[PDB]
Amino acid sequence: LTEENAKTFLNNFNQEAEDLSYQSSLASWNYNTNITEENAQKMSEAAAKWSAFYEEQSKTAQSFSLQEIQTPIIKRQLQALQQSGSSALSADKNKQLNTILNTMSTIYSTGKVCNPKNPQECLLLEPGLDEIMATSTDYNSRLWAWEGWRAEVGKQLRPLYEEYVVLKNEMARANNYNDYGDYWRGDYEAEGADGYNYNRNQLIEDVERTFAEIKPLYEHLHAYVRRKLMDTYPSYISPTGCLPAHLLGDMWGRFWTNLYPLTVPFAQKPNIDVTDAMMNQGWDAERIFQEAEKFFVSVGLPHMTQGFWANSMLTEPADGRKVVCHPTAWDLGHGDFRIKMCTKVTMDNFLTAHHEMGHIQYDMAYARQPFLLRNGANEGFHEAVGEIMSLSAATPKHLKSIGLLPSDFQEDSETEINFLLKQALTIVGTLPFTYMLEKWRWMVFRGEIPKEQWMKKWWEMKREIVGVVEPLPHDETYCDPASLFHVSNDYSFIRYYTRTIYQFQFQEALCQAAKYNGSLHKCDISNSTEAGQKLLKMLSLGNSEPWTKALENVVGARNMDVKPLLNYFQPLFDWLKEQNRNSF
Amino acid sequence: TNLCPFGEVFNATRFASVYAWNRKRISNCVADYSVLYNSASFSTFKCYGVSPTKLNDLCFTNVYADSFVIRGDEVRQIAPGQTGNIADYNYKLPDDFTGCVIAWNSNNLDSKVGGNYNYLYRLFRKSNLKPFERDISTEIYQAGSTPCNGVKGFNCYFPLQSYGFQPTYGVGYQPYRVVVLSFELLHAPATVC
Ligand SMILES: *[C@@H]1O[C@H](CO)[C@@H](O[C@@H]2O[C@H](CO)[C@@H](O)[C@H](O)[C@H]2NC(C)=O)[C@H](O)[C@H]1NC(C)=O
Ligand SMILES: *[C@@H]1O[C@H](CO)[C@@H](O)[C@H](O)[C@H]1NC(C)=O
């Protein structure tokens, strides 16, 4: 009692966890720098030790029953440590259960797939050549080259998954909850006082009423793309059926390697050749990054550590000395705060740099709330922080006021359309996918009927939503969420959903307090301290205060608000709305 | 003429811990303070109630030198009318005291690769420590689920933990080397000047 046993157990938890996390981060660093596979063996050993020790902590969480009489603030930590997690179960069941996902992944890296009936340009499905060997608009020699590939993958995915889904039902039966689908959403509850509890089904009540009034947003998007496909050659869209799905190259709807260039219908305006005109100056990776601190001295945020600029790895290799190059920012535990990205100099390199720059500044805000709140405060804000600053820095007037772009070339009123076409494209085509997918994902593990009737209704749903169909349907040898390294391995998938809304919420939050007349698109970041002052306090909250109470105090928000998103582009939605009356 | 060797005390070889530290005696010596004033190597040389110019002219019967190592952030938290884990369970200063505190940085010497775990800390005690405390006893913490009779049950666990040290840590958590000067006046003659 008197919160000494809990304090001491949690402090020992903090010490051991910091040591283990620092060891694991150091092992990751040594692995990605001096790979020898015994560093990876020690990685596995330390991870197994950490897991077993954490399971013992979960067992020792049976140390004090709670009931209701207490009203402390440490109750969040109490339930976090008492969380069952992967604990319990027989030592035989989960011991073979955890040996499934890794051995599933082995059939992917060892497989070799290249151009069929073409010994030339034959190479593995890797992004080095995939961009040009897959995302090319070809019709005759591409139709039958992917059915075989996606039937070869799905040869054993149905028989494996039909047992996998029922074998994971053991965690559903011993998770102290009732349904595996609701297990994920059962950890989002935020209560600090009466009237600020999160209702489990608040989403299904509020969002679904508002989804009806936004219908015309989607039907007319299809009328835009037909301005190009129907214009060139009269063999893409057959009148009997609907538009094809193979020539696009990516059914995931994330990147467009050929739609993006040929996007503006008029194509008379001059594009931007900034990189060609700036390569002569000498702006390399080290010469680039100074913009962040030049902004932040005007804002007031703390500078980076000596190790931050001592650990860059922005130099070219000598001869073919490749490494694992991916966007990865890590906390690395006890105040390390290191960024790792081996980047060259390109135009999109600017869009890269700020995006992971935001992560470390956001992390350097809640370091005073131990390891209890050093975790991610919210699943959506983590990427929103990285992307909001970047999109704001993407302002042409921002990039002109520094002294680089001549004032003779004044800004125009039609190029913002070209700027924002892809920005409004990439973050709009995913929301219906995710909303259908997550709810029906929680529906399908109930198993009312196996999966040989859902695909039939899938096509009817798609036709009544957008009207997409292929002339000769395939057989049942597929699984959409299976061939994905970020889905099959069971990560958080609403994290690719939430980031669209909160960025616009915070952009509106700044633009309503930026004291700017005229339009609402000319919001600029430089030379502003009040915004940073009001922002740092929100960053430095963590799991201490519910987001509901925080948003109430800031502006008033019981739930999500998308009408900022609607009204921030409705003055630009005239083109999508009124010019599209001659088609359905 | 006949100066008191502060250098061997400061630039030592084997270093003191925070839970087993011992006093150092200064008697029959001469004071040389301009070196400290213009040392030019001082992380935090701040102290109130004494002025360095006239500190040369002051003489005291007994002088105790205290040196220890703590986390860089809490170097200024050691003061009268202060709190914290170190203040309440590891080391506390009398409020009436009016000496001076000096901070150094020893990353180039103290730290190493591998997280030197020799340095420790004493957290477990039933109460707060009286000022100027030194004990070798390790009295049983009165927390016996039922007996703590050397049995690992409830509230009975290992009380000693480490403090890792690598150069990769942040500046605020780098090990700072801190020395404490004790000043007091005794009726006995003051041969230290
Ligand atoms: C990474 O650093 C090590 C440190 O010397 C380099 O040499 C390895 O050292 C370990 C430990 O002494 C030996 O067990 C290995 O046999 C050494 N050679 C290796 C791992 O190839 C190592 O060469 C460095 N790695 C790279 C890629 O430069
Ligand atoms: C202590 O630091 C170094 C290491 O011994 C030494 O060279 C220096 O002269 C000393 N500082 C003094 C004597 O003030």
Residue numbers in the entry:
A (entry chain A): 20 to 603
B (entry chain B): 333 to 525
From the manuscript:
Here we report the cryo-EM structures of mouse ACE2 bound to trimeric Spike ectodomains of four different VOC: Beta, Omicron BA.1, Omicron BA.2.12.1 and Omicron BA.4/5. All of our structures show that mACE2/hACE2 bind the RBD of the Spike protein in the same manner at the binding interface of a RBD in the up-position. The RBD is highly mobile and its transition between the down- to its up- state reveals the ACE2 binding site and allows for it to bind ACE2. To gain structural information at side-chain level resolution of the binding interface, we performed image processing of the cryo-EM data by location-focused refinement on an ACE2-bound RBD that was the most well resolved.
The first mutation reported to be crucial for mACE2 engagement and shared by the Alpha, Beta and Gamma and the more recent Omicron variants is the N501Y mutation. In the mACE2/Beta structure, we observe that the Spike N501Y mutation which replaces a polar asparagine (N) residue with a polar and aromatic tyrosine (Y) residue, allows for π-π interactions with Y41 of mACE2, and enables a new cation-π and hydrogen bond interaction with histidine H353 of mACE2. These new interactions stabilize the interface between mACE2 and the Beta RBD. Beta and Gamma both also share the E484K and K417N/T substitutions in the Spike RBD. These two residues are unfortunately not resolved in our cryo-EM maps. However, in vitro BLI experiments showed that while the introduction of either N501Y, K417N or the E484K mutations alone are not sufficient to confer binding to mACE2, at the concentration of Spike protein tested here (75 nM), the combination of Y501 and K484 led to appreciable binding of the mutant Spike to mACE2. The emergence of the N501Y mutation found in the receptor binding domain (RBD) of the Spike protein of Alpha, Beta and Gamma variants has been associated with mice susceptibility to infection. In accordance with these results we found that Alpha, Beta and Gamma Spikes had a higher affinity (Kd between 35, 45 and 25 nM, respectively) for mACE2 compared to the ancestral Spike protein (Kd above 100nM). To our knowledge, there has been no reported structure of the Beta Spike bound to a non-human ACE2. Our cryo-EM structure illuminates how a single mutation, N501Y, allows for new interactions especially with the mACE2-unique residue H353 via cation- π interactions, analogous to K353 as observed with Alpha, Beta and Gamma Spike bound hACE2..
